[PDB]
Amino acid sequence: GSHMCDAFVGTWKLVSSENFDDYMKEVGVGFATRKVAGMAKPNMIISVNGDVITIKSESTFKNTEISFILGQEFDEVTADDRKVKSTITLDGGVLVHVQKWDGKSTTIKRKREDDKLVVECVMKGVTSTRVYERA
């Protein structure tokens, strides 16, 4: 049967980034990490097995992997080494990823738009847009 996550499954490569340095600043990422992370051109690999969704980010900077069930909180060590409590839900057809730590919160939304997978990262007033195409 078809599932709303089907439109995300596959291998995706980063094709454009907007305001990513500013977003990382707002999150609290250090200078050196921002420079090395901002150079990266990651692939994102999304797969599903039953109710478990796995999202990998793979680049010369870091390889990360999260597996989760929609709506069930999990612990995540981010690529910038924050230990956060994450919950990922479906809002319509948008995957909405909330990361919480030290009384703060950031929201990463992943949506399909034409043949692209668009990632919007928001911290306080700061929005970064990262666009991926199929790899």
Curated annotation (Swiss-Prot):
One of its GO terms (molecular function) is long-chain fatty acid transmembrane transporter activity. The modification Phosphotyrosine is found at Y23. GO terms for biological process: brown fat cell differentiation; cellular response to lithium ion; cellular response to tumor necrosis factor; cholesterol homeostasis; fatty acid transport; long-chain fatty acid transport; negative regulation of DNA-templated transcription; positive regulation of cold-induced thermogenesis. InterPro entries: Calycin, Fatty_acid-bd, ILBP, Lipocln_cytosolic_FA-bd_dom. The modification Phosphoserine is found at S16. The modification N-acetylcysteine is found at C5. A fatty acid binds at R130, V131, Y132. It comes from the Eukaryota. PROSITE patterns: FABP (PS00214). GO terms for cellular component: cytoplasm; cytosol; extracellular exosome; lipid droplet; nucleus. Keywords: Acetylation, Cytoplasm, Lipid-binding, Nucleus, Phosphoprotein, Transport. A motif (Nuclear localization signal) lies at residues 25-35. It is found in: Cytoplasm; Nucleus. Belongs to the calycin superfamily. Fatty-acid binding protein (FABP) family. Lipid transport protein in adipocytes. Binds both long chain fatty acids and retinoic acid. Delivers long-chain fatty acids and retinoic acid to their cognate receptors in the nucleus. Monomer. Homodimer. Interacts with PPARG. Forms a beta-barrel structure that accommodates hydrophobic ligands in its interior. This is Fatty acid-binding protein, adipocyte. It comes from Homo sapiens (Human). The lineage of its organism: Eukaryota, Metazoa, Chordata, Craniata, Vertebrata.
